[PDB]
Write a protein that binds this ligand. Structure first.
Ligand SMILES: OC[C@H]1O[C@@](CO)(O[C@H]2O[C@H](CO)[C@@H](O)[C@H](O)[C@H]2O)[C@@H](O)[C@@H]1O
Ligand SMILES: OC[C@@H]1O[C@@H](O)[C@@H](O)[C@@H](O)[C@H]1O
Length: 718
């Protein structure tokens, strides 16, 4: 039966994962389709309650990785071996058995949301909450799902699909439509002006970036554009749906945000303009009033949230409350805001402050209900007014929202980029990587803005390049490092986006690279015909379980040595043109060192990194045409994600020939065991270099493709 409870014990493929599973914990594998290869778990209690804690069993001697909410809004990672180490507000738990991997997915059921938490007895407790004292229940059958497999990533996906088939209240990442912003460079106003942003600042930032050769094709006009007011350090509330004075044209005050949209798009050649709002309008909601049925509500504190983030008790939102739009009028509110924005030429919204809803369900059916109602409405309005699916979810890491994520396709995957907080950089990289393991099953991760002139610029930039997600800076105008940005952005504003959410390697899933003092974090992704691997030292800082905030902590050495293997890129097979004959050998190109190495299957290459250093590798499967004649494309070697440039690849072994289609421009690189006879671009022979010791072939792709004809056609004649 595979996943089962027998005697006191949760058993997984003849391995005991939990002991002492109490009698009131019930399981079922029945479904709709029907017998399912894991188990839905619930329990029955004596009493009808709005909150229940129940032990699932005792976990000891089993390595795990967890994503837990360290703030209301956001998750980070914790590893361990003992149930006592499972944080409060654990929303995703992955367990390794010495090789089998078990996922634990705490779910929404009816009006209740679940999470996992550890106790001092090493039990894994299921915490069920409605978020409303009037919404009570005594039994549950589907509040947790457990599934096991031999591939850790496949095991997660398969369990999410099974959860999907049960709830039907969300779709998986790959089943949704990505907005077009994800293929272009962008700029966000946030760190440039904070709330002081003006239409003139927006223009100046766009102008300065395009001036250096790296033109953004989207912009996010961040927080500061909306009409907001304090009540008659006081919180601001939304007072109208239209822009404030800073975005009304300088002479004709009846033309509003449309002014800056036209300047962006018509004067500066941007494709997309997005704007920020809170899911409640502004931070203090909407000013009470009848138009949107807005009434003062005060955040309710839940124990697990406040245990991990005590400052949420005395947050400005908690003490001064929000004007919460009525459920009756929430569609009207979003439609009227969004119809105004779209008629002005706005293409999308970055919708922040998402999780507050879970704290405001008191009159209203609870956290799950209110969350669902507000997202149903938001989704109707976005699909109406922003039909490229122009929505970026922000501050949204609760399961209440994830399990109703039926449409939006991009999610901010960590706490904000913090230009002035030295502790935040290593932690940002670890958080985005680990969170993406789980968040990426729902939506494409967004690894946030960053600064091109900053001591950790390269660290952040290189991570964004391998993220799979949107690539955007928040530079103040004129504060740019164009040498860095050319590595990310082509002259037409396009980028070399990888295909998956960037994630830790199998190797790294259970070793905490922020806390263990021992390991390098390795992040893998895929292009069509290469893999890519980023390696990061992010030791020395993490969220402290004692101080309940991010701090520095002691590390044994400055420098650490780990190692790299082709097969660290978990799906590398899929880049091979002939994966049934491939022996697993890869060409491996270090983008910073400019070094090409051939790595046979399983051979390890040492990598040594000090804290806050990184290295990026393009990993390309070698094709063996005939004995002595081997090849692998690398791509645009002066860009971080070099392999992202390769759109087509055909080997013609009977002609000793390679045929590629390559986007972009700049220097193109490939591995060849032999010096080519001719490299031909667009039906003309060109000059090339060949290093005969490494096999590195090199030639220039001069200009972006003439037209419209979006790819360079390249033939390499061996
Ligand atoms: O700026 C206050 C506003 O930001 C949030 C998170 O977006 O809180 C951050 O700033 C607070 C004020 O100094 C801190 O107490 C808090 O821990 C930090 O996350 C919102 O909570 C808040 O309304
Ligand atoms: O008020 C500013 C905003 O809210 C944040 O916490 C964050 O996600 C920023 O990227 C941002 O737009």
């Amino acid at each position: 039966p595979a996943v089962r409870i027998s005697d006191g014990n949760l058993i997984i493929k003849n391995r005991t994962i939990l002991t002492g599973v109490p009698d009131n914990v019930i399981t079922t594998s029945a479904s709709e389709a029907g017998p399912v290869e894991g188990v839905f778990v619930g329990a029955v209690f004596n009493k009808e309650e709005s909150k229940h804690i129940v032990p699932i069993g005792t976990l000891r001697n089993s390595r795990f990785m967890s994503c837990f909410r360290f703030k209301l809004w956001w998750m980070a990672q914790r590893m361990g071996e003992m149930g006592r180490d499972i944080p409060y507000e654990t929303q995703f738990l992955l367990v390794e058995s010495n090789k089998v991997y078990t996922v634990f997915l705490p779910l929404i059921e009816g009006s209740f949301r679940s999470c996992l938490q550890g106790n001092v007895n090493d039990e894994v407790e299921l915490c069920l909450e409605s978020g409303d004292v009037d919404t009570k229940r005594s039994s549950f059958t589907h509040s947790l799902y457990i599934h096991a497999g031999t591939d850790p990533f496949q095991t997660i996906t398969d369990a999410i699909r099974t959860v999907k088939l049960h709830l039907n209240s969300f779709r998986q990442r790959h089943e949704k439509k990505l907005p077009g912003i994800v293929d272009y460079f962008g700029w966000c106003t946030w760190d440039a002006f904070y709330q002081e942003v003006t239409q003139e600042g927006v223009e100046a930032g766009l102008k300065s970036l395009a001036a250096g050769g790296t033109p953004p094709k989207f912009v996010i006009i961040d927080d500061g554009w909306q009409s907001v007011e304090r009540d008659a350090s006081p919180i601001f509330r939304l007072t109208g749906i239209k822009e404030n004075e800073k975005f009304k044209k300088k002479d004709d005050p009846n033309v509003g945000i449309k002014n800056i949209v036209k300047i962006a798009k018509e004067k500066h050649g941007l494709r997309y303009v997005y704007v920020w709002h809170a899911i409640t309008g502004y931070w203090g909601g909407v000013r009470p009033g009848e138009e949107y049925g807005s009434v003062m509500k005060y955040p309710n504190m839940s124990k697990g949230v406040v245990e991990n983030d005590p400052t949420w008790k005395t947050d400005v939102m908690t003490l001064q409350g929000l004007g919460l739009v009525s459920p009756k009028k929430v569609y009207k509110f979003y439609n009227e805001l969004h119809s105004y924005l779209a008629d002005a030429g706005v293409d999308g919204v970055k919708v922040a402050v998402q999780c507050v809803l879970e704290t405001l369900g008191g009159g209203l059916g609870g956290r799950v209900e209110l969350t669902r109602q507000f997202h149903q409405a938001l989704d109707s309005s976005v699909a109406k007014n922003f039909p490229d699916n122009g929505c970026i979810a922000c501050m949204s890491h609760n399961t209440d929202a994830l399990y109703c994520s039926k449409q939006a396709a991009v999610i901010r995957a960590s706490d904000d980029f913090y230009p002035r907080d030295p502790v935040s950089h290593t932690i940002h990289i670890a958080s985005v990587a680990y969170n993406s393991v789980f968040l990426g099953e729902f939506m494409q991760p967004d690894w946030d803005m960053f600064h091109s002139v900053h001591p950790a610029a390269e660290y952040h930039a290189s991570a964004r390049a391998i993220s799979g997600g949107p690539l955007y800076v928040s530079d103040s105008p004129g504060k740019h490092n164009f040498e860095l940005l050319r590595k990310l952005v082509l002259p037409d504003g396009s980028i070399l986006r990888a295909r998956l959410p960037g994630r830790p390697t199998r190797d790294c899933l259970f070793a905490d690279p922020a806390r263990d003092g021992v390991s390098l974090l390795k992040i893998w992704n895929m292009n069509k015909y290469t893999g890519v691997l980023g390696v990061y030292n992010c030791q020395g800082a993490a969220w402290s379980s004692t101080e309940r905030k991010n701090i520095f902590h002691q590390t044994k050495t400055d420098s650490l040595t780990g190692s790299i293997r082709g097969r660290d890129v978990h799906s590398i097979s899929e880049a091979s043109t002939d994966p049934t004959t491939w022996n697993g050998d890869c060409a491996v190109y270090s983008q910073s060192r400019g070094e090409l190495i051939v790595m046979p299957y399983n051979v390890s290459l040492p990598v040594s990194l000090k804290i806050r250093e990184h290295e990026i590798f393009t990993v390309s499967p070698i094709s063996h045409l005939v004995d002595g004649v081997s090849f692998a494309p690398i791509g645009l070697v002066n860009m971080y994600n070099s392999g992202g440039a390769i759109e087509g690849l055909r080997y013609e072994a009977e002609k000793m020939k390679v045929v590629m289609e390559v986007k972009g421009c700049g220097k193109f690189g490939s591995y060849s065991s032999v010096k080519p006879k001719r490299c031909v671009v667009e039906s003309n022979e060109i000059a090339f270099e060949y290093d005969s010791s490494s096999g590195l072939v090199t030639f220039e792709l001069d200009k972006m493709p003439i037209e419209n004809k979006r790819f360079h056609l390249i033939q390499v004649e061996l």
